[PDB]
Design a protein around this nucleic acid. Structure first.
Ligand code: MG
Lengths: 70, 172, 29
RNA sequence: GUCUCGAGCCCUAGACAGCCGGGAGGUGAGCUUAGAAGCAGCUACCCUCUAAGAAAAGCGUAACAGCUUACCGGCCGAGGU
């Protein structure tokens, strides 16, 4: 019953709407530990065995919005 | 080129001159396979189609002869069957088998019955809105099925509106 | 002999230690 | 239409074609929009599982659905382009 990826990002970022062009226009920002929490929740929604690979899937939506990493 | 077709155990094949006769539990089919320098013979339990010529035109008929023989094999054992469905929008169409021909009455409200003679030892059986054309000779069976569909061909009016007629549904 | 077909055999053999033709190929050696 | 000659690339580690099977998750990508979920538009076009499987090639729907596409596996077996 866990909600989609897009929502959880907007929760722990502060911003709602994305941008017309991703990566070219950075909207929000996420840290190392912040993205680690999202991967902890989605387990059945993701096919990955290790916790490492689960994060890669999540990032596959962030950069295509305008979210830099620190 | 030389092609060898191993004849099925159910089947027995004889041949004299240019005619080949193939017999099985489902009946017999005889065909005349005639083309320049293409010899078709029965060497025991194998039918041989050979020629010293190997040009495009000769190779074409050789491939054609093979399928004709393989089809005769299939027809005298498993047989050939085509399925047809009779569809009508307004006027109830009457499709029946009368002797050696299928008769279609009241087609599009016509007074005059449309009809077509059945080819060879082909059997046409109708179960309500379904028809099944079958027999050993795919030529006769395939034609009879096609003839029935062609029998309700409409030239004068828009076919997208007037679609009544028996259609080939299942092809072997 | 496509390189991907060679890299595959090596990858299969690596798992045997620890396409059907490539599986057999790996089995053989 | 057919005959002859030459060059490139592919192929028994199985080519070309056909048939069978798979064509999967993140999530309906984001934006736009009341909604648009491969397929209105703009922009991006990224990574998981894996033998493959597009941020979707052609239809399809009001939008979905659904049908095929690439792509992978099998059957077949000799030339294919
Ligand atoms: Mg007119």
């Amino acid at each position: 019953g866990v909600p989609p990826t897009a929502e959880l990002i907007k929760d722990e970022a502060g911003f709602e709407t994305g941008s017309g062009e991703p990566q070219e226009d950075f909207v929000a920002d996420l840290s190392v530990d912040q993205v680690k929490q999202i991967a902890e929740q989605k387990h059945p929604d993701l096919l990955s065995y290790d916790l490492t690979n689960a994060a890669k899937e999540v990032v596959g939506t962030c950069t295509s919005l305008g979210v830099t990493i620190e | 080129p030389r092609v060898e077709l191993e004849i099925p155990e159910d089947v027995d094949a004889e041949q004299d001159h240019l005619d080949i006769t193939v017999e099985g539990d489902n009946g017999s089919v005889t065909r005349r396979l005639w083309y320049p320098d293409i010899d078709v013979s029965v060497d025991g339990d194998t039918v041989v189609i050979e020629s010293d010529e190997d040009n495009a035109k000769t190779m074409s008929t050789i491939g054609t002869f093979q399928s004709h023989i393989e089809n005769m094999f299939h027809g005298v054992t498993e047989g050939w069957e085509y399925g047809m469905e009779v569809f009508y929008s307004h006027f109830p169409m009457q499709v029946n088998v009368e002797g050696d021909e299928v008769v279609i009455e009241n087609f599009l409200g016509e007074k005059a019955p449309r009809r077509t003679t059945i080819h060879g030892d082909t059997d046409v059986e109708i179960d309500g809105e379904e028809l099944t054309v079958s027999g050993p000779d795919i030529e006769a069976v395939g034609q009879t099925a096609a003839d029935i569909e062609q029998l309700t061909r409409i030239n004068d009016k828009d076919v997208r509106v007037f679609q009544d007629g028996v259609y080939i549904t299942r092809k072997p | 002999i496509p390189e991907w077909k060679q890299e595959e055999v090596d990858a299969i053999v690596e798992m045997i230690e620890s396409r059907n033709t490539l599986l057999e190929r790996a089995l053989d050696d």
